């Protein structure tokens, strides 16, 4: 739900920076 | 007292606009400075570009001031279940941040205080030691600053 | 100490995000946030309309360490000689940004806390007597915000 | 000089909004 949505994201985020 | 605090007032807004100006510039008041605004670039930058996804999920957020502890706990509980990285700590920012806004829209603003309240605890107590393990907010801002 | 420090800046990277998040959607952490966020964007405003007179004037700033005092109080001094308004209380503001933007660009990073008390200083013992009896900094977040 | 500039420019966005 919001929290799987939200954790999705939050990984895309990272990988992309660190 | 009053008189105190007006000084003491005054001296953060010029402290609060210089670090601005400094930042627009890349340079920074403090340490302290330099990690908030990484935080506040990192969270609209997240927020820009999975906006799609991010509106999704906060769309579906329908707080009540009885129900708010336990969204925010379960949400916040799942996002680090399987582990932290500083994409998460963001995401987590970010979804506070839209909790407050969406708190705000519905005329709960009691909830602001409490939502932040929340926020820094978890922090404080769940996040802090792999924060610590990774380089410290330092390590951060060289890589979202 | 070193452990309470470090939960109370965790507090006010909350508080800032937060504070940030809420002004996005026009909303406000508290009435300091509010004065804050309407100087910043007073400052942006006052510098993106008057770009070039203001790139002119403070390109003829040519501050060393020991001439800062005197640069500062000076223009100072000339802006508020015939009168104090919220304009020029911004373009103050603009003024002392400049001058540490320009400080730390020539490795005068010392000046910028020394600035920042300068201001202070001129704030709360020549502006604040005219923002006091002309309705407060309330009324600036009214007019400017 | 440079605080002439400066005067000038906060009374013109002074105008404006107050």
Same mark, same amino acid.
Request: one cysteine or more; glycine letters at 8%.
């Given at each position: 739900?919001?929290?799987?949505?939200?954790?999705?994201?939050?990984?895309?985020?990272?990988?992309?920076?660190? | +007292?009053?008189? +105190?605090?007006?000084?003491?007032?005054?001296?953060?807004?010029?402290?609060?606009?210089?670090?601005?100006?400094?930042?627009?510039?890349?340079?920074?008041?403090?340490?302290? %400075?330099?990690?908030?605004? %990484?935080?506040?670039?990192?969270?609209?930058?997240?927020?820009?570009?999975?906006?799609?996804?991010?509106?999704?999920?906060?769309?579906?957020?329908?707080?009540?001031?009885?129900?708010?502890?336990?969204?925010?706990?379960?949400?916040?509980?799942?996002?680090?279940?399987?582990?932290?990285?500083?994409?998460?700590?963001?995401?987590?920012?970010?979804?506070?941040?839209?909790?407050?806004?969406?708190?705000?829209?519905?005329?709960?603003?009691?909830?602001?205080?409490?939502?932040?309240?929340?926020? %820094?605890?978890?922090?404080?107590?769940?996040?802090?030691?792999?924060?610590?393990?990774?380089? +410290?907010?330092?390590?951060?801002?060289?890589?979202?600053?």
């Amino acid at each position: 739900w919001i929290a799987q949505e939200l954790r999705l994201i939050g990984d895309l985020f990272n990988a992309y920076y660190a | +007292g009053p008189l +105190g605090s007006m000084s003491q007032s005054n001296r953060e807004l010029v402290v609060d606009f210089l670090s601005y100006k400094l930042s627009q510039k890349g340079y920074s008041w403090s340490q302290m %400075a330099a990690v908030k605004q %990484a935080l506040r670039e990192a969270g609209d930058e997240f927020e820009l570009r999975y906006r799609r996804a991010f509106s999704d999920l906060t769309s579906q957020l329908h707080i009540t001031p009885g129900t708010a502890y336990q969204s925010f706990e379960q949400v916040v509980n799942e996002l680090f279940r399987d582990g932290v990285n500083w994409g998460r700590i963001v995401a987590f920012f970010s979804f506070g941040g839209a909790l407050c806004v969406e708190s705000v829209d519905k005329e709960m603003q009691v909830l602001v205080s409490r939502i932040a309240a929340w926020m %820094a605890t978890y922090l404080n107590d769940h996040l802090e030691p792999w924060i610590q393990e990774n380089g +410290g907010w330092d390590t951060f801002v060289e890589l979202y600053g």
